[PDB]
Amino acid sequence: ELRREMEELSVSHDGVLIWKLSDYSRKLQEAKIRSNHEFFSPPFYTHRYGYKLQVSAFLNGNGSGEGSHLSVYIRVLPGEYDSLLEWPFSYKVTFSIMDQSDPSLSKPQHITETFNPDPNWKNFQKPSTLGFGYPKFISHEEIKKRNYVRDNSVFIKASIEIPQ
Template identity: 75%
Template sequence: MATGAPWGPVPSRCHLGRAAVQRVTLLPGPPGHQGMCPQESVYCENKCGARMMRRLLPQHALAECPKRTQPCAYCAKEFVFDTIQSSHLSVYIRVLPGDYDNLLEWPFSYRVTFSLLDQSDPSLSKPQHVTETFHPDPNWKNFQKPGASRSSLDESTLGFGYPKFISHEDIRKRNYVRDNAIFIRASVEIPRKILS
């Protein structure tokens, strides 16, 4: 190998100088280059099946890979991105332990209402909020008084809600999303005797 020779493919002509006859000589790269080359075509490390140049892997893993993980801001668990994608917006309520549990009446039996707020200008059209209401079943374990043994991460008490509250298609039909934000109101009807 010649000193100072460039690394990689080197085109050269035959000894007759004919342009049509060409061969490529591959020179070995620097030690350790193989397996680290940013131009090398590799498969995604998350096993999503995508193949790309190694230098594009970080961006793919961060924002494009359907097998990337997304941490939940509430429970700190990580979920695979393609398992949390769906065709609908879902809403849930879950009873968690708190400092004032001994002052409340159990089981939790108060009416719960979820509303997706229409952000259309009310002077142009009447807002069409999407609303669902339910009364908890007092026999269901998810609405019993949380005990010390029941942690906030206990998967046996996942709560109650609507996995198909509204379709993504219906969300786009009105101004439910405005400035890249949605507003969901969750209200609990509390009896007067607790308020007084």
């Protein structure tokens, strides 16, 4: 299956995944209709034979962010190499929404959060489903400022700290 081996060559470079959401305005409008409308990133591996992770977003917010914020979560997926890895998952995760301006002409102001995975979080235990994240990661009023939206797309970056 060429789709299935498509997914196995999805690996983060130095632990970094950048998820591009294009056609933001059309996707936001759909999210504002659907009460729990969640977009999912392509699966990515932390390192080559490591953990399979996936990022998701609620363009019109989840929980306390509903109607006011973009909510961002990450979750562990069942991976082909899980029985070789340490459990529970515990690498520190950092979320960013990118300020899309030229780093030479200004200093971009990315919005960033970082957490250390909770050892009791069910999803961070060895897969055999609720992801961890930020319901109020960035508000609709803030994402309209600077260049968090540009050419009608947004960039979510997830970066995992690998001890190497």
